[PDB]
């Protein structure tokens, strides 16, 4: 895939620096269009960053900050759109790279960057950085007033080499010959927003951005608005003319391209767009395919459980005792769940009591989270996450720190117990620094994820080779060695049969306590009135008409405890009176009343 999420962690120091770069790597490996912000922060000196080399286009901002690395290989980046801005002003922010052989970014090397659509540039405190003052930023900007939002520090600890002798007019992104700045705006003819040269015939189509290779709207280096299968357009496709032409029907607007159908975890709108959140007056219906769609409520919209980052909890940063009751009986939360140290310690500033462990019971019904699950603190009483026993999907439509849909850190649970979890819609999982936690690598994460660009990042849990004995590794009866915790009630898939929650070797088909039939690998009880059979099948189903033989009397076709004595199967039906045989089959009574009948007959009717 070419389109990937950004991050949203700004200048915050990494939650686990051990696996921070791995996060970045998985996130951007192969990615071309970053649907969000490109944040390259806190990168060590030797850092291998070749996974960035396909990034062509960024929607949000680009933030390169707090790095000791000498260069970030972003040579193919053509356009940042600035749909979101750093510090609400900047589309490109290069901050604090290197301390106040030596560490720090030396060159920018954004050799292809020829369009910043919105916001300015902020470059500050980079003691090793050269050539940033060289660039004619005006050209890159879409409008000139973006110059008024630009601050470029040139304080520097080293002398810079000149631009390559092969450089046009002393403007470059680095010492290389292919590092010269390519001007596509200020160097143009007549009208022309972008040109490939100074002649009128070198103008790019009205609909290009960054530049072009020719005059047609298919020669664009970037689309100003929308990419319709290699053609830049103002809109995603009411007809006026009496005909039909090629280029398929109508499309959904997803990011800055028109696409046939919305990508995996998104939602199609009536307005004709893809989204991770529906508008007001709108539900969310699942098609038989699994496809999701926002649509207007026919009645007044029914009750909806909003999690964090949604509705009244949009500012609220964690599940506390103040809002825990809001999730009572919720099968599906629209938003995220976050449990922080402050959840269980309880903020003593506000009159908010520390949340007690048994209050987490509210989540027992929970099956779906649209946002993310984040657990950085958990009660020391609880050995596992069994309160989330029934959670099936975490969509990850909202990702914690813009990257993780499931984070478990610093917990000291011994096992997971998330035994219904079958899907992580999108985003990465992070499970780190849980010193007691086993059963992390007995989970088939490959099957929980959807796209193959997501992964589990793990470090400083209980060592894998130390999860070996009983109560520390999967039970014998777990199929393919997969489980969420210890014992035959924690298997992902069941090797043999299930009796309720438990994996069992055999059902009691031929021998045992109460006899059983099997149905879809499930042990299920015969009817009490079935007669257990010697080494043979006792029953075929749960109903009393499915016995091989009756334990007491038989009342065609049922095995009964006693023969009917004045029962009426319903109103308006006359009562049914019966008596047993020498064999045991219930027999109908004769002439009505006087001798109301039973075995040897009784009066009183």
């Amino acid at each position: 895939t070419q389109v990937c999420t950004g991050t949203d962690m700004k200048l915050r120091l990494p939650a686990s620096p051990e696996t921070h770069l791995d996060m970045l790597r998985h996130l951007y490996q192969g990615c071309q269009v970053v649907q969000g912000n490109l944040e390259l922060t806190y990168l060590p000196t030797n850092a291998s960053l070749s996974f960035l080399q396909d990034i062509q286009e960024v929607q949000g901002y680009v933030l390169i900050a707090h790095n000791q690395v000498r260069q970030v290989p972003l040579q193919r980046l053509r356009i940042v759109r600035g749909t979101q801005l750093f510090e609400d002003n900047y589309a490109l922010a290069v901050l604090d790279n290197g301390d106040p052989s030596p560490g720090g970014l030396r060159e920018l090397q954004l050799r292809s960057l020829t369009e910043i659509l919105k916001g300015g540039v902020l470059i500050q405190r980079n003691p090793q950085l050269c050539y940033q003052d060289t660039i004619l930023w005006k050209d890159i900007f879409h409008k000139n007033n973006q110059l008024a939002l630009t601050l470029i520090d040139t304080n520097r600890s080293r002398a810079c080499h000149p631009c390559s002798p092969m450089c046009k007019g002393s403007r470059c992104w680095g010492e290389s010959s292919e590092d010269c700045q390519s001007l596509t705006r200020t160097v143009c003819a007549g009208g022309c927003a972008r040109c490939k040269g100074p002649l009128p015939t070198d103008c790019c189509h009205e609909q290009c951005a960054a530049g072009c290779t020719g005059p047609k709207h298919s020669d664009c280096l970037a689309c100003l608005h929308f990419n319709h299968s290699g053609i830049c357009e103002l809109h995603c496709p009411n007809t006026d003319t009496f005909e039909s032409m090629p280029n398929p029907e109508g499309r959904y607007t997803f990011g800055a391209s028109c696409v046939t159908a919305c990508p995996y975890n998104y939602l199609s709108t009536d307005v004709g767009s893809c989204t991770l959140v529906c508008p007001l007056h709108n539900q969310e219906v699942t098609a038989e395919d699994g496809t999701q769609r926002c649509e207007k409520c026919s009645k007044p919209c029914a009750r909806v459980c909003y999690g964090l980052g949604m509705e009244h909890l949009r500012e609220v940063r964690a599940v506390t005792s103040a809002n825990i009751q809001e999730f009572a009986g919720c099968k599906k939360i629209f938003g995220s769940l976050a449990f922080l140290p402050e959840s269980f310690d309880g903020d003593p500033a506000s009159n908010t009591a520390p949340l007690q462990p048994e209050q987490l019971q509210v989540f027992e019904t929970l099956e779906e989270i649209t946002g993310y699950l984040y657990i950085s603190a958990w009660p020391d009483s609880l050995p596992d996450l069994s309160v989330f026993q029934n959670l099936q999907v975490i969509r990850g439509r909202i990702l914690h720190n813009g990257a993780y849909s499931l984070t478990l850190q610093g917990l000291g649970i011994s096992w997971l117990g998330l035994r219904s979890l079958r899907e992580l819609g999108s985003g990465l999982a992070l499970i780190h620094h849980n010193t007691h936690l086993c059963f992390v690598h007995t989970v088939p994460w490959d099957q929980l994820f959807r796209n193959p660009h997501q992964a589990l990042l793990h470090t400083a849990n209980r060592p894998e080779d130390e999860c070996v004995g009983e109560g520390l590794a999967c039970h014998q009866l777990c199929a393919r060695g997969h489980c969420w915790g210890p014992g035959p009630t924690q298997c992902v898939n069941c090797s043999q049969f299930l009796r309720g929650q438990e994996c069992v070797e055999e059902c009691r088909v031929l021998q045992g306590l109460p006899r059983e039939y099997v149905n879809a690998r499930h042990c299920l009880p015969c009817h009490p009135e079935c007669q257990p059979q010697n080494g043979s099948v006792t029953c075929f189903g749960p109903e009393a008409d499915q016995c091989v033989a009756c334990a007491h009397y038989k009342d065609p076709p049922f095995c009964v405890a006693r023969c009917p004595s004045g029962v009426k199967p319903d109103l308006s039906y006359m009562p049914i009176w019966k008596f047993p045989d020498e064999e045991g089959a219930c027999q109908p009574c004769p002439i009505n009343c006087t001798h109301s009948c039973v075995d040897l007959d009784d009066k009183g009717c």
Partner: antibody
Amino acid sequence: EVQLVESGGGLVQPGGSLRLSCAASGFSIWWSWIHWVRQAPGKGLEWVASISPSSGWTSYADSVKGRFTISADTSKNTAYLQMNSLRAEDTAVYYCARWWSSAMDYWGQGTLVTVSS
Amino acid sequence: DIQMTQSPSSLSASVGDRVTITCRASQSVSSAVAWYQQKPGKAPKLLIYSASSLYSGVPSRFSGSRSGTDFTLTISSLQPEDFATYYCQQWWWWPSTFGQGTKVEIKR
């Protein structure tokens, strides 16, 4: 405020059975991790069985496996220890405790089971 | 299984003395060790958990240190109510296991 009040001890004939209760207040037994520990007169502490009722994981010491059944009723907020086919060396003071951090913080008072004729 | 071994079996000390009790794991048991104080015929009381950390409400006298597989419950200055049997317990391997106990007696 967190308490474990256990009961059910007393006298049983060899080969007979007995069930021990461990009623909790201040916390849910279901989500917790309950452990049984015994102490024969003038002996060390001996682990017997355990239960994580929510997860369903039950564990027994080789010493009592096949004779003892650990269980919990959620509504009563109580853990039980069913003991079958009791013998002389089962005579002890049985405690129930709650797992915490990686220790047992709250203990029951301990009930005395005596196996005699 | 895994063996917790305490030393000494018994010790006698006067009021104010620095009592130390050793507990030795047979294999690496990580930091996952607990210390209990049991007065005759009552429930064990938790003193130290996770080798070093002491439980709430426990007096300043009781401390715990780990060196490899050698764990040391140490009472800085003994007091007359400290007469009990002390047990270590490991949590790393399953099932969890206790030490055989150390009986501490008061000299006067």
